[PDB]
Amino acid sequence: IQCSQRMLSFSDALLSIIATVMILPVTHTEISPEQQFDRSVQRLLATRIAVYLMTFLIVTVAWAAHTRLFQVVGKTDDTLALLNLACMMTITFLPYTFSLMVTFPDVPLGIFLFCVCVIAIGVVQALIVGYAFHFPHLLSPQIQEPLSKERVEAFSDGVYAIVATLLILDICEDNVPDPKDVKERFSGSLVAALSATGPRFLAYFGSFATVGLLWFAHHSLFLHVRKATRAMGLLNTLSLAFVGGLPLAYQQTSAFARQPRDELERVRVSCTIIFLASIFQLAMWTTALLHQAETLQPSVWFGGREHVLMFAKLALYPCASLLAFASTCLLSRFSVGIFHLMQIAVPCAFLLLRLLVGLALATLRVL
Amino acid sequence: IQCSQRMLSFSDALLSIIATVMILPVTHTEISPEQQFDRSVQRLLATRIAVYLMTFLIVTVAWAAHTRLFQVVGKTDDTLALLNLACMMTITFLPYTFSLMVTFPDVPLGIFLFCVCVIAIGVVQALIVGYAFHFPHLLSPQIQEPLSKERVEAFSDGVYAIVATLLILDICEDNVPDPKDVKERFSGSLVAALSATGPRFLAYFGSFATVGLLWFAHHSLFLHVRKATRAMGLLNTLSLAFVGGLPLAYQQTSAFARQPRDELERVRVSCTIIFLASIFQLAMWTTALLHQAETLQPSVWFGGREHVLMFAKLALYPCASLLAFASTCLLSRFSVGIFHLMQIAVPCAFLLLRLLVGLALATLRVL
Ligand SMILES: [K+]
Ligand SMILES: [K+]
Ligand SMILES: [K+]
Ligand SMILES: [K+]
Ligand SMILES: [K+]
């Protein structure tokens, strides 16, 4: 009998990467002035967005089934490990079945291979169940509906890491020039080029800061979580689905970004994505506050020491993005600058969150 | 005081992905008959290969420094978590500095920004050390040279997962056709197309099986490892570096694959990569057998129950790849078929490894 921790971690990594890499087609969508107000391509963009959403949700359902199964298994074996690898192999093909369905929705091939993949996952999981039940020692101690916190955390970490990787790759592929366009830039000089490249580098830092602070909020929340509800699982799945779309909000090479659009509505889109990624973490926290006793640790209960701190940590980004959107709709003038300033202010607020919360609540105290 | 497990797992995931995604430039290298025997582009391919190797090794050195640091830290904090995120952000930029150096090696800009990134990583880690030492409770229990097995395992898992993702993405982007080339294929019929697409799908299954079986061997080895040596760490780093090159051996869209080359030498290249990825795992095992007492569990010691099983598990792929290369050099006729057959036989051998080993050693016993 062997421990199953590492195998499940590998499965979580693979599944998270598979669910998150469906955003690349969306980033690669190209609209330029040839189709400025073309309806077909403009709705094609939303088509690809929705396709990404559904593929992510399907892969997440598969991951949840895997979690429920290896909650029952408990201890792994060589045969069980190879069967798990087969299941991973079958799951990895679902994105391809969707990728064949997108181009020819009416012709039934994609239908056929998608159903085949699903039924194959089913038979593989059933074989795992049978092999485990045949040998008692391979079953869980209790058998021999909460989700597992470790698997949720691993999936979330994988998604966030893949997002950051996408950002850095965008930068690396855009900015790096080659010679003759270099000396068409300047006196064969790449220092002038470099500082003509600086805002791009610093934008990368800003986007990575956004993603890392969202991960920090999720990590702080789940450090204080005793048990993970199914509702919290759904809300985390939605939060991660909208986190996967952050590259679309922060990218330069992406043919999505290279399209005719004003600064104000790009700010609106980015703030929409950020708000949707954050409000679901806040919703997880609110839902857990419903039965703290089973879902939360005593420190963050109503009237606890770190209750206000956690609430502020989770409500920082929602409020900032919402007020930036409100600036877009209200001011009409200083919106892009307000977005830039928010991307700078939120990190420092996270760094000095404790002092801010303390002095703020004292102020509210005596006045 | 908070637990540092999840933060370190996230760091490992990010670093593994960053180290492994440098292979994409190598896959995207394009050579076609315009430059059939051009020396410049042919050596440019090896240039990009070496660049990938060095970038991987540098990122691995950074990851090892991070491991050594948070071996001393032990318990994390909000400030320490944000500083760790800053360190990750700084490390993610190293691939970009190399990406700017590749195009202009002589101009000193890449030099400058690479040195700046390294010194920034240094100051961030020094600040973490100082903040930790200032507060005793944030230090390790003992302080208040073996590597950590958990971090090694996480890094390896990330690398393998990224490789599998690259493979599936290759398939998805190549094969999916669009309409007018569909009905240029056939009677507007995508079933004929599909079975004109089948060898590609099944090649994906084969490559994923290769990667998953290598991961299975690594997992079985490290399940029986009590302590991880520095030499074992170096050998694992080399094994992972050559594992990252498996997509180059198994890919179809990659402009690397779409170049003039015979089947025999492509087989040779793939078998070379596989042998280099496997011999280093076998070397880790041999090195650990030098001081089993501290590095290995009793079950796999000389004369143990699972000693022969582990040796066979780790020597399966090396011998198969070596004999396929030997077929290429000797037979000259049946080499490609032998490679295809090996890609089928090795998995089943892994599935029936125990029975094979048992009956083989009994045979050798009485005869
Ligand atoms: K884990
Ligand atoms: K991961
Ligand atoms: K881990
Ligand atoms: K990983
Ligand atoms: K990628």
Numbering used by the authors:
A (entry chain B), B (entry chain A): 30 to 173, 254 to 476
Show sentences the authors wrote.
Transmembrane protein 175 (TMEM175) was recently identified as a constitutively-active potassium (K+) selective channel expressed in lysosomal membranes responsible for establishing a membrane potential across the lysosomal membrane. TMEM175 is implicated in cellular proteostasis and its mutation is associated with the development of Parkinson’s disease through a yet unknown mechanism, underscoring the importance of this channel to regulation of cellular homeostasis. TMEM175 is evolutionarily distinct from known K+ channels, displaying a unique membrane topology as well as lacking the conserved TVGYG selectivity filter present in canonical K+ channels such as shaker K+, BK and KcsA. Consequently, the density map revealed that while hTMEM175 is homodimeric, similarities between the two 6-helix repeat domains result in a pseudo-four-fold symmetric architecture.
To investigate the mechanisms that govern hTMEM175 function, we collected cryo-EM images of hTMEM175 purified in 150 mM K+. Three-dimensional classification revealed that two conformations were present among the imaged particles; class 1, which was resolved at a resolution of 2.6 Å, and class 2, which was resolved at a resolution of 3.0 Å. To better understand the functional states of the two conformations resolved in our data sets, we next superimposed the class 1 and class 2 structures determined in the presence of K+. Overall, the two classes are very similar, with an all-atom RMSD of 0.9 Å. In contrast to the rigid cytoplasmic side, differences between the two classes can be readily detected on the luminal side of the channel. When viewed from the luminal side of the channel, the ends of the transmembrane helices in the class 2 structure are rotated in a clockwise manner compared to their positions in class 1. The luminal loops between the transmembrane helices also adopt different conformations, with the loop between TM9 and TM10 undergoing the largest change. In class 2, the last turn of TM9 is unwound and moves nearly 12 Å from its position adjacent to the loop between TM11 and TM12 in class 1 to interact with the loop between TM1 and TM2. The comparison revealed four overlapping peaks in the class 1 maps and three in the class 2 maps. Identification of the ion-binding sites enabled us to tentatively assign the two conformations as an open state and a closed state.
